[PDB]
């Protein structure tokens, strides 16, 4: 009768041990699952807000330079880029090439936060330009970061709504050009030649991507960006490969996958060709310069010896190589696994809802302009705010109904103000952070809970089989 | 002593087999769970972008027709729709009725992509009108689809940002009407009588729903639509009932649940009443015509015999029946299970973030207009771009500061351009696709992992019970 006993015991043992092997195999493939939960009690970290002027250059500083005699380089540069033929003519008829081939003048022409940010107010407390760290970005020359993680440790929202949040009255400084001057529309550029502010609401301590990640905002409108905070926490080894590292770039940035991809693209570009792209994050590696830098362009323009014929092609080898490598990188994602890099173990993103409204009312424009002057403008009678304030002040102090002229003055003041000024509120709609946490699909505690009951008896029965077998 | 043995063995067997029955029952109800994970390496399929002009008709072609003598039908149609009384007077005082009762003239009046799309640029490469497939939609007459899945197989984004994405400089062709003519505001229409472009960013190869799924975009603003790709993969039988089929409509569309619901609504409407709705997708079934077609409206207007009194009611039975069936379908979702149809096993959706900015700067308007002419307009001196370009060119070539007149010319050029022109960028913010995959809640491998350990021993003990019982 023991034959049936042995056969059924063997069959049961094989079944149980195959089941246990299947379980330990399921654990061996370290699967993960993303669990989303709304945490309404965890403190919300206010993001980092990078504001850029969509128009990089300022026509006011340009006009000032022509009225003086320090614009010669620019006057040379234009005279150079418009006399010789260049490949990618659209690139060096643009402003990025102007930045690359002469950087100091580009800085001297770019916008300043003083002139740009006219009023700032965070968490019901006044903030100044001292809360914004400046940085540079080609085609978005000057970009200023509030809550950049450098001046102060970090900023937190304990309150929702646009009242408890960043509020920026910004003048885009859209100034009328020189009397006989018009800019060149770079048609290979999908983001520039627009009036407004490019805002990047990104994770605190992470480098901004004004081109890729920014959203633009128009003048003459109060635009409110309500944010919902998403916290994506990942698993390190062995379940995943995220690390709590920090990107290098120019300055230590909190790690984000896209920013690291941009940095490794810049490094690959630096390796393949001996130049660097102003589209990608800066790296400041000696002696690497910008791609599309004609080193002797001043000498070429200065036709000291007549080997440079009119409308002659200029090589620009580095620019072509950069274009080739950028095309290969943009049309193929295989590089993403070479420079590797990893997702941040903890990442913070934001769902932004942008809603705009007509701002400011013609009723409050005079009271606005009064304070904007009283705080920021002691000079420059030839300014929009001043011409607008003259109209509004003669309306409010004539010394019934608005006359046609009175109406014309009010309308001209409103057009000036709303062509130049915009309010931008950035706030948390709710303090409930939506957390996507990566969890082990088959935890080790789960393995123990699913094997121990079998294993405790079946190791003993294996010992029984041993004793019955060879003794 | 064996009585206690038998009783405890029986109790344990009943418990174990009830547990196994509970598990196999849990498997019998083929539950599913949606698991969301962010895949940062899978290739992202660029969507299909359908641009429509919010104003279906073009006042320019209308004026041209009146200056010629081929507008008679229209001149008759108006003279007809405004002389006789009709139920739903708002419907046939609209443009959809004009399309339905005389289609060819509606096509001749509708917008052309040439005139509409002024500059296109996808993935840093120039694109023309040859990349857009035309299609028709009542109240959105001409709708042009980029990446429609017909001209080429499919399009992929390997790069983020507005630079590597679709960029469309579109002129809405908002032309001033005839000197003594005004349109009729159809107040039963919540979407028309607006200036802009209706954009549908929908799954590639899926029919566009400009009314239901489109979002509108204003002229004079560069609007950037950043897309985040969501891939929802479902389970076929036995867990679900999705299929990888294709809708028919006019042309083979990739299956989406809403589009199939619209098609089955159109089929139900074709069955219940012998007509068809221009609001719903077209089907082109002979000999079915549009609801709200008065077949002899030309004969009715031509008062050859005076049985048609002034302001007399006209029956329009088919229009009333279509209104009845549409009301019943819109106020009751029970039809959704009759025409059945299923969710696509694999569906692609997009979270779009639209941010607008003032475009173009007055600095770059002349350089823009120059190229728009040099590429697209050899004729029509009586055009906005031409009058605007005259102003800008006399500003830039007068042959200091802008004079009042100079300022007036600049302002009038800017108003014309920004009333007619708009830039639209559509791009992927990130290439990380958020994939919601439907997974078996209780997989068969899980059933085996949860039963085998018990089953291996307990079938053997059942054999023991057999042997002890009847032998």
């Amino acid at each position: 009768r023991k034959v049936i006993w042995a056969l059924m015991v063997i069959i049961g043992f094989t079944a149980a041990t195959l089941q246990l092997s299947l379980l330990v195999r399921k654990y061996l493939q370290f699967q993960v699952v993303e669990l989303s939960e709304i945490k309404d009690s965890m403190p919300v970290e206010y993001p980092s807000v990078t504001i850029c002027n969509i128009e990089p250059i300022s026509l006011r500083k340009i006009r000032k330079a022509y009225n003086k005699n320090e614009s010669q380089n620019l006057k040379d540069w234009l005279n150079f880029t418009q006399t010789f033929h260049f490949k990618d003519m659209s690139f060096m008829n643009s402003i990025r090439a102007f930045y690359e081939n002469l950087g100091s003048d580009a800085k001297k022409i770019s916008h300043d936060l003083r002139d740009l940010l006219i009023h700032c107010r965070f968490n019901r407390e006044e903030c100044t330009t001292e809360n914004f760290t400046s940085s540079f970005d080609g085609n978005y020359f000057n970009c200023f970061t509030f809550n950049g993680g450098q001046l102060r440790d970090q900023l937190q929202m304990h309150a929702t709504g646009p009242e408890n949040g960043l509020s920026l009255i910004i003048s885009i400084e859209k100034d009328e050009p020189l009397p006989g001057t018009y800019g060149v529309y770079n048609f290979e550029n999908n983001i520039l030649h627009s009036a407004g502010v490019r805002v990047v609401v990104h994770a605190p301590g992470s480098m901004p991507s004004p081109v890729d990640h920014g959203f633009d905002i128009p003048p003459g409108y109060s635009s409110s960006v309500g944010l919902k905070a998403l916290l994506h926490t990942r698993l390190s080894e062995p379940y995943g490969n995220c690390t709590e590292d920090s990107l290098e770039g120019i300055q230590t940035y909190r790690n984000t996958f896209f920013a690291c991809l941009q940095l490794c693209k810049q490094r690959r570009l630096i390796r393949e060709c001996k130049c660097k792209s102003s589209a990608l994050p800066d790296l400041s590696v000696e002696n690497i310069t910008f791609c599309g830098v004609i080193p002797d362009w001043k000498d070429i323009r200065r036709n000291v010896t007549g080997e440079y014929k009119m409308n002659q092609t200029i090589p620009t080898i580095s620019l072509a190589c950069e274009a080739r490598v950028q095309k290969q990188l943009n049309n193929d994602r295989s590089y993403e696994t070479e420079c590797g890099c990893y997702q941040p173990c903890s990442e913070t993103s934001y769902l932004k809802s942008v809603s705009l409204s007509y701002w400011p009312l013609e009723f409050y424009q005079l009271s606005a302009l009064e304070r904007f002057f009283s705080q920021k403008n002691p000079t420059d009678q030839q300014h929009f705010m001043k011409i607008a304030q003259d109209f509004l002040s003669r309306l409010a102090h004539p010394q019934t109904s608005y006359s046609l002229s009175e109406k014309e003055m009010a309308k001209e003041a409103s057009d000036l103000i709303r062509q130049n000024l915009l309010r931008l509120n950035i706030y948390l709609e709710d303090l409930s952070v939506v957390e996507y946490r990566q969890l082990p699909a088959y935890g080790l505690a789960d393995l123990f809970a699913d094997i121990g009951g079998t294993l405790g008896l079946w190791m003993g029965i294996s010992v029984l089989t041993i004793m019955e077998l060879m003794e | 002593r064996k009585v206690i043995w038998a009783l405890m063995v029986i109790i344990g067997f009943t418990a174990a087999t009830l547990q196994l029955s509970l598990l196999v029952r849990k498997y019998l109800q083929f539950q599913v769970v949606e698991l969301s994970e962010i895949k940062d390496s899978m290739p992202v399929e660029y969507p299909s972008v359908t641009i429509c002009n919010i104003e279906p008709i073009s006042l320019r072609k209308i004026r041209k027709a009146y200056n010629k003598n081929e507008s008679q039908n229209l001149k008759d149609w108006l003279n007809f729709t405004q002389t006789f009384h009709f139920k739903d007077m708002s419907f046939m005082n609209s443009i959809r009725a004009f399309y339905e009762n005389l289609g060819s003239d509606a096509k001749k009046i509708s917008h052309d992509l040439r005139d509409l799309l002024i500059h296109c640029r996808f993935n840093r490469e120039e694109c023309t009108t040859e990349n857009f497939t035309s299609s028709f939609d009542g109240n959105y007459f001409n709708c042009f689809t980029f990446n429609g899945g017909q001209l080429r197989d499919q399009l992929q984004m390997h790069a983020t940002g507005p630079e590597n994405g679709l960029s469309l400089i579109i002129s809405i062709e908002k032309d001033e009407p005839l000197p003594g003519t005004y349109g009729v505001y159809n107040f039963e229409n919540n979407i028309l009588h607006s200036a802009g472009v209706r954009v549908v960013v929908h799954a590639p190869g899926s029919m566009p729903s400009p009314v239901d799924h489109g979002f509108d975009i204003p002229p004079g603003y560069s609007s950037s639509v950043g897309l985040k790709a969501l891939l929802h993969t479902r389970l076929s039988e036995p867990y679900g009932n999705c299929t990888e089929d294709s809708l028919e409509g006019i042309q083979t569309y990739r299956n989406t649940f809403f589009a199939c619901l619209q098609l089955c609504k159109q089929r139900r409407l074709i069955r219940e009443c012998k007509c068809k709705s221009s609001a719903l997708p077209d089907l082109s079934v002979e000999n079915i015509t549009f609801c709200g077609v008065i077949p002899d409206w030309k004969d009715i207007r031509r008062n050859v015999t005076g049985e048609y009194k002034m302001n007399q009611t006209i029956p329009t039975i088919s229009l009333a029946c279509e209104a009845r069936v549409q009301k019943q379908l819109n106020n009751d979702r029970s039809y959704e299970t009759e025409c059945g149809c299923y969710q696509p096993c694999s569906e692609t959706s997009y979270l779009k973030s639209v941010s607008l900015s003032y475009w173009p700067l007055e600095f770059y308007q002349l350089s823009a207009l120059e190229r728009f002419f040099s590429q697209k307009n050899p004729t029509d001196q009586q055009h906005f771009m031409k009058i605007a370009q005259d102003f800008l060119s006399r500003l830039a070539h007068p042959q200091t500061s802008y004079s009042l007149s100079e300022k007036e010319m600049a302002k009038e050029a800017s108003d014309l351009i920004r009333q007619n022109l708009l830039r639209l960028n559509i791009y992927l913010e990130d290439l990380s696709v958020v994939e919601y995959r439907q997974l078996p809640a209780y997989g068969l491998a899980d059933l085996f992992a949860d039963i085998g350990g018990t089953l291996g021993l307990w079938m053997g003990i059942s054999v023991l019970t057999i042997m002890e019982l009847m032998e």
Binding site: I57, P177 | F363
Partner: peptide, 4 residues
């Protein structure tokens, strides 16, 4: 980047 700007003509006259």
């Amino acid at each position: 980047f700007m003509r006259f």
